[PDB]
Subunit: 279 residues, 3 copies
């Protein structure tokens, strides 16, 4: 909403005089904004026709203001009646059956979700962590000890396997968040970080580690590129040869991600994940 | 027990009329069955003389019925008196010192174990997750942020190192669970999934990722195979060369597991893990 | 303090008659010692001029005595009012705002820290695990599902990325703990274990797995070594070629860590992590 956006933009440029004691329109707009984020009714980044993802910067600014509005406090519920110390509440703070019923996702103990992360109906949260401003769309599977970092956009039917980490991107304002598009399968122990994008229907194997510094290599040609996995890619862990050692015909090889197949919606629908990864 | 098995088989074929309101013999048999699973008095898969693992399908059917019998509910105990939302209780629900004394394992906060997973005496659960129907045998070490997936069979004295994930296998009925046999050491960040089997006394290094699609390669010959690590194997992360790039003598290499040594009970008893992995 | 050290040394050699019922000077000295560890006023290992790390063995002995002094007990606070079963209390046991205020670190639910681990001001604990006797120095970032193992020494401004595990070293007495020196960046999914040392200002990429058995390889020469990353190293995941298969010119390659750059304080200050890892 246009009024909220206006209040947040002005407030953020005046943020040095926003603090735990602030009330009025600024506290209300920031509060409302994070509520809208929590319900997925607005999102940090959205895909345009043009097929690219655009940042809604005012939403990152709302999140940043909430740090100023909200105090560090003792947060009960640790082992032996002990406590934590932080300034971000659980998404599930005060939730009863009414709220869980309405949201329609599964939240397995002891998963952690911070307020302002949207979890869509039919998502399954195994013990895992979903950070501020994230958007986890319908039917997503967030497996054990996975992580959905700040502002991260996780598509419909995405499977984040055990120990998969999707890196957070809050600051800078302009910086696009990490994006896993609709219907990707991401194998166990993989990491995608730093505003990298995995396009729709891709299949990553285990131990695929993509950040802004990772060579993503075309199997056919050796073409090296960064930051983006094309649609319907099959990507596995591998290496590229390095310089040979003085006077010898061999050297160490270095990690890269390897695109082993550039497939198809049709093919993805006709071919199992394991078939894709095997032959 | 034979009566329980009979009640469960009939109930499972009639499962569409089993729900949270079901009581009588069906609720009792399912309940008893999961209790027997929780105590390790029965198990999802067992090793036969013949040396292979056989699925007790009725036990998978009991677990699947329990989803129908048990409601989604608000589960207290999250941060700031917040709650979770799921239909599987903690193994430790209502446990006092009597139950922990009898079971004889160590449960470090904030590990999570779902009811129907057997944890044997002298096991150590660091913060970790053990899923339904798992069987964790005597003296097993389940290190921090490890995962023991549904129905997984973990042998005596097995060491699952930090961040090691053992994949769950519930459906299909016939599908064998992931099996780590007696006295295996599994190095940090490794994953074994999808009904793959690591045979007795094997030593896996760090980042060894075995699923049904992973090439497990014999170091001596290049022989490629799938799904099973032989007894007393020493297995490390590696690669195999791919196709060379157009007109060149080189190409990218792809991840595989590499069997670097096919050893011995004697040798495993005489040789340290690090010695095995080093030379 | 010299008196404490004396009481602990004598007690440890008499440890077979120390138990949950022990009181007097032995209970008090062990208690005080772990309190000093918890506050970082003493540490398990310290860097000498001479530039090497020396073990304070009496502190490892205090920790080991505390196992004898402290009983297994039911520890409340699990899901659905369920409990854990262990003999080590949370660092945060009984902590109010006074204690968190004084310590000055951030403790995000649901991180776990055992009593006797020092967390310095301005550290940030995401959901993670810090074990006994660890020393986490000022401004350290402990990301989600990271692990700081027993006695581990983590330097000032160190960034342990998602899923990074730093291995614990309690016994043997003489064994030096795992050490990450000041200003290291450790990329996601990496593991450093077993008393290995990463020297000051080093940058490890994702999936760098260093233990006592891991070949750490010099990119320029192929020089293979173990246990120590030199200062201002840039280290990435890679491989070294193995024996070729019978009669062929090729074979499988095996995992190693690769030092790709031996840099500089100046260079580290002038060059971003991603620049260092990229070119």
């Amino acid at each position: 909403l246009a009024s909220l956006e206006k209040t947040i933009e002005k407030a953020f440029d005046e943020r040095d005089g926003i603090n735990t004691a602030t009330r009025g329109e600024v506290r209300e707009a920031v509060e409302q904004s994070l509520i809208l984020l929590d319900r997925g009714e607005v999102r940090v980044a959205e895909k345009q026709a043009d097929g690219n993802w655009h940042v809604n910067q005012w939403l990152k600014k709302a999140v940043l203001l909430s740090f100023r509005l909200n105090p560090m406090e003792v947060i009960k519920g640790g082992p032996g009646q002990s406590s934590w110390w932080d300034k971000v509440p659980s998404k599930f703070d005060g939730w009863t059956a009414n709220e869980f019923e309405k949201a329609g996702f599964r939240a397995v103990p002891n998963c952690i979700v911070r307020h302002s992360a949207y979890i869509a109906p039919n998502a399954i949260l195994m013990p895992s962590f979903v950070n501020l401003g994230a958007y986890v769309d319908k039917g997503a599977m967030i497996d054990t000890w996975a992580t959905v970092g700040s502002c991260a956009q996780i598509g419909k039917n995405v499977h984040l396997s055990g120990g998969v980490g999707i890196g957070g991107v809050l600051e800078p304002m302009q910086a696009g968040p990490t994006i896993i598009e609709d219907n990707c399968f991401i194998g166990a122990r993989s990491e995608v970080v730093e505003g990298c994008i995995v396009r729709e229907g891709s299949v990553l194997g285990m131990g695929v580690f993509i950040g802004k510094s990772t060579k993503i290599v075309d199997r056919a040609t050796g073409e090296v590129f960064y930051g983006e996995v094309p649609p319907y890619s099959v990507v596995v862990a591998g290496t590229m040869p390095g310089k040979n050692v003085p006077g010898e015909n061999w050297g160490p090889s270095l990690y890269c991600a390897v695109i082993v197949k550039r497939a198809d919606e049709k093919t993805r629908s006709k071919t199992s994940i394991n078939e894709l990864l095997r032959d």
